[PDB]
């Protein structure tokens, strides 16, 4: 007999094709997509709880650290730490999905932009994406002069929220 252990279910009618109908079935794909999403975070979320080995401290260092004053520690509340871990987890999700693609935005009206950045129609990748519009025929006859009320200004540089109040308050020149 045969079964798929992501779904945990046995196949009802065993043939080769019923397997392939289950192997590329919508239900089964959503399981195996979700199964590896759980094993991804679990290696990171279950952080290596290391084992400590405490040495018997010296007579010398015990006197040199006694004269040194005891520093204050900061412990947050349970309600506080449940929110701050909700934030810091959601922040690391953002740094995954940045993908800084300003450079594609800069060469928009150039003479080979269809052939290099559209990426349905390169050579290296182009045959593979057609399986799984802005065509390759585009030349520099259409849109001769870019600035004819068409172009958008460059989106300004991003900044950190936490340190949003380090910015100089006034601009040097008067913008419109």
């Amino acid at each position: 007999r045969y079964y798929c252990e992501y779904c945990h279910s046995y196949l009802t009618h065993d043939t080769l094709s019923v397997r392939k109908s289950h192997l590329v079935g919508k239900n089964h794909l959503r399981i195996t997509a979700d199964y590896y999403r759980n094993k991804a975070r679990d290696i990171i979320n279950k952080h290596n709880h290391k084992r400590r080995h405490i040495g018997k401290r010296g007579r010398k260092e015990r006197e040199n650290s006694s004269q040194n004053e005891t520093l204050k520690v900061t412990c947050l509340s349970n309600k506080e730490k449940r929110h701050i871990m909700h934030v810091k987890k959601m922040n690391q999700k953002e740094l995954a999905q940045t993908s800084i693609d300003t450079l594609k935005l800069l060469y928009d009206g150039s003479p080979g932009y269809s052939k290099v950045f559209v990426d349905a129609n390169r050579f290296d990748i182009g045959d593979l994406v057609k399986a799984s519009s802005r065509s390759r025929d585009e030349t520099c006859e259409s849109n001769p002069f870019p600035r004819l009320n068409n172009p958008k200004k460059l989106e300004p540089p991003k900044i950190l929220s936490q340190w949003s109040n380090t910015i100089p308050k006034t601009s040097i020149f008067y913008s419109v």
Binding site: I100, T102, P146, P151, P157, K158, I159, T166
Partner: protein, 136 residues
Amino acid sequence: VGLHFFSGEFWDLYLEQISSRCTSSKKYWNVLRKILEIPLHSFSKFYALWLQRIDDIMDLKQLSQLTSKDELLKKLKIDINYSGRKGPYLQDAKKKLKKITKEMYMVVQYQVLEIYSIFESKIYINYYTSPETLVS
């Protein structure tokens, strides 16, 4: 082409290839110390990565990979050989170390927001086109 104002996405390749490939994790701190001093368009994506490391530093030995044993004790006055009850001491070291990042984020941000607001905002065309193209 490292100081190119739009080089942001070049370094993101280079940092992808250190983490992925190399084992030690002393080059990844060494390179990222450079990107912090350059006025790139997207610099805040590189301070976010520095601040995600500093927080995840969990032992005092891991502050040696940032900067030398001496320059820690002189410029900030924190010691790695401090044997004691470390928890608050490393919680202090971070707060003292995170500060001089923030003063560097004050330095670069002035240089970026100058260059963006004066020059780079206005320049609408960064490519060649042809000998028949005319610029504004």
